[model samples]
Target: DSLSKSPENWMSKLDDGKHLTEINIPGSHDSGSFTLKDPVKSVWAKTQDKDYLTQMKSGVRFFDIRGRASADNMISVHHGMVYLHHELGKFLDDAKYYLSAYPNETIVMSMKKDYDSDSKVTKTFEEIFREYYYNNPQYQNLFYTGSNANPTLKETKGKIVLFNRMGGTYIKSGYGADTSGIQWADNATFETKINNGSLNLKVQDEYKDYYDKKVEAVKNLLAKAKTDSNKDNVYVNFLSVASGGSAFNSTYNYASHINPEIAKTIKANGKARTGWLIVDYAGYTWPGYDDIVSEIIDSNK
Candidate 1:
């Protein structure tokens, strides 16, 4: 098959002994980007054309959720454009629905500062999570508060693993061992080596004004990551791109050019090792999107 568009519960096929960190998971860069009202005025932040519900059903397990503080003392999501009025409760609802449907799957969500001007945004966001997600009886048992050090699928089934980037001691917040406590290899460009506890990642996010060059850069790093000897290390290849010059409109517009090449690369490296591939505009219907995810799952087998 060229690609599998239907939601097949890919995680259910994984070995029972395999940990979440040990296997390759497909992720979306800006997972909440679907609607862009008033494109001429709003920032071009439509990294994705699908909603969270569609993404989950299409086999996207990891989500990069960027939240900002609204004027009403509530939290909203953002990427390049502000998702005004979109609150954290929507996130909880999405996770709860999908986790309930797919009992064997897990959601890896990373929360970070977006456009909110608050200095204590972490505290505010944490408070919102407590009120919206934690306090809710329906979602209480769905979160994994266990040590996130290479947690197995058996341990994290039907749960959401919180990856908090806003630095603070979250032991009291009840999100379990936060991933921010380690030396997270987070950069906008390629890094040969990275260490975050058990997470050793090879990342490439060079968003150049030259689209072809940027694609080549990612392909080069991805090639190395696929052939690298360290099977335990997490490899994150970015298909997300941003233009530096005024010739292009926004990063969201690069999907047509970048996504096809990403699919080609994934096809070529299907038999090799691939870790986590973080992409913009992920979905089965989107061009070159489902193949990357399908290939990642195939690598595990």
Candidate 2:
């Protein structure tokens, strides 16, 4: 009855031939910024406080990671502040560890380059990811490499799927050219197109610039996706917004303003359409204890 124990662990219950696109998954926006601590809060700051391992345990299978190039040219976990010194390898290790414990679950990582766009930064990050996570013999079998095809749970039961938004080829040749390697959609605003294998999903990026309209806009998008007969289309209802104007903006940041409405909206209309709810401050201390996340995971049942 309690799906929170391991929401991803129940993925095996899905049909064998079902495409990954047809399913609903919960995700975190700016998932790597929990450690940031700057006095002057940037608009793009901490969205989650829990570590990656804790998030995985809390039923979050999708991760939106932004890597910044450090002074030494190494990639570091970053948002507004480069707080986390650890590189992408450490994140891979965390996912590997979790997958080892819960083989039934899979990690869908969407990685991108943050503030530090040094032109060569993305390539450097890609090289490291390939050397550390991809080329390693230990993960060769664990990382899903089947390009141009959507494997069922039977195929990718214990694997790490990469959604490369960082830009650049994942591999020099061979399997890398396929969809599973360097496949990533453009930044979706209002709507984004995702063509992973045979599934072409038109995801909604509905991230509003005004605080007052975000809650209603997101709920409307969710409501629209729920009734639409297009099962292949994936809706990403981003419940985060930033602005440099208005009294509401002066009072609250992204987390404080949006977290409450996200909880309220999900509790009200989540049972119908449970598409990917990519939120800022997912596990907030305000209301406390998995509100939006728990609702999304439960709606899948």
Candidate 3:
């Protein structure tokens, strides 16, 4: 039951009258501008609005954003949902009671698999030979069901892993390099490529633009690092752009072309950043949650 991919299985009650079911997507929000440094300290930080503060004191959605604290908040969602139909008052007491009894530093050894991989794992060029595979009609076909005519509606996966010692040591990332320290390299590379006008192509040309951007991204980062060195505001390095889940994962490479641009602040702020990426081959699979997780999360574990 736990392994079923269908979205309907997780629900306890469905509004059969209207054919609606409640469910959750397994992911975390970016929390764009919200930064909760420390629960113990910030919990007591000055609040201008007593009403809002009262809501917080009444066990509202208060939690840290970084590290294990985030994970803890995520897990608690399931608990609150179970009591959804009950009176908020009944649930509030139990919720506060549970919160008060929390034992700090609690870690959940992943019962289900994590959704990203470790770039530290090595993958040689020879091992990733079929990445550019294409069939006639210029449509790249994927291989599923391995043997016996390779199912058309199926998907194939190919991956290459890399590691970043510097990133892991200094700026620790809980997920893969894409979201961690290597974000610096990805960001730097993104800046060089896009600013040079290499990623100016439109959508219909995704297949061509995608790979071109990656190659361009790498070259741009290298060029900027060399040309702008000692410029008081320039830095760059290596970052593997992955694309093995589906068309969407491919888009990560396409759309993620801007991270480096955004990362300019950190570079100029005099910060050290480095990390590797795990490349994956989607082989006709549409990038879905599991596929993305496989390349990023599974590879790491």
Candidate 4:
């Protein structure tokens, strides 16, 4: 039978009254690094096998978006120091298109300042994101302006909710003074209280420090999310990390090993809140195609 949470419009299946924190969302790490066809740079930097729009169609609702401030005052998509040939404006444009086509959906994005190496851009990362993204007239109505740290699914329909990775000062005034944007720690697993204890976060993003350790952090965190009684806590578990080495221990290699285990774990568990499974090559690049996104979405039932 055709399900409500189809690959292209998964959020429609979700009950609109539920807070986003309670859902089992599938997300992509480095959501915009798709242009990395280059042999050298792609080996380390390239994370996503498909573009952001395709991932959206594949039931990925959350985005780990990092941008570099280019000299042109445009936000360039990136994976670390590697500059991917995509603009933040274009990303929003794509999101706008997606939302209009599927108004029942919401895109939860974690926006971060990858770097500001471009000497020509004198403004800070916050300023650039403010002017180039938030303040951009085209996207003015596209973001969630509500102050709720954990908004309900209905509140975010056809809009983009933020997980502010850089800082919220640039956006607070523009994003509305009462609105509290989300912020997360880089490359570590930590819990944070947001919006004056309005929401709780269980973030596990240990990232490529050591392959085993990173997986260890992610596995246990998933364990917690599966067993946790707190429906208000937002669990953001990132499985994408570069365990530096040649063919033996690359990001691709580790993802290949870990992706299946995660699929099995989620499949083994019931339709419980498994939290957000953020990964590289989103749907599991290893072996045959593993539809982890749809697998996570099915947990809602």
lDDT of 2 by residue, 177-267 (tens): 3334434333334543344333444444544446656666676777776776565555666676644544335213665656665666666
lDDT measured at residue 229 in model 1 versus the true structure, 0 to 100? 58
TM-score of each: 0.81, 0.78, 0.19, 0.90
What lDDT tens digits, residue by residue, belong to model 4 across residues 48-111? 7887788888888898889988855688888878888887877888899999999999988878
Q: Write the per-residue lDDT of candidate 3 for residues 1-301, one digit (tens) a residue.
A: 2312322111222122210000111111111112223333222221111121222222222111111111211211111112111221222333234333431101100111112212442422111111211111221221111221111111111110111211322111111112222222222333221112212110111222345665555444434433331312222222223234444443334324323332332234332221111111111123222332112111110
Each prediction's RMSD to truth:
3.9, 4.3, 22.4, 2.7
> What's model 3's lDDT at 154?
12
For model 2, the run of ten residues with the poorest summed lDDT: 172-181
Give the poorly placed runs of model 3, Cα more than 4 Å off: 1-209, 246-301
Residue 138 error for model 2, in Å? Answer: 4.6
Q: Compared with the true structure, what per-residue lDDT tens digits does model 1 show for residues 160-276? A: 877655544343322223424324444455433222434554567665436777787767776776676564565666777753334365665575557666776677765665667
How many clashes does the backbone of model 1 have?
0
Q: Which TM-score value belongs to model 3? A: 0.19
Question: Relative to the unseen true structure, what is the C-alpha lDDT of residue 106 in candidate 1, on a scale of 0 to 100?
Answer: 84
Count of clashes, each model? 0, 0, 18, 0
Candidate 1 segments whose C-alpha is farther than 4 A from its true place = 1-6, 41-43, 71-73, 117-138, 172-187, 190-196, 228-232, 243-249, 284-290
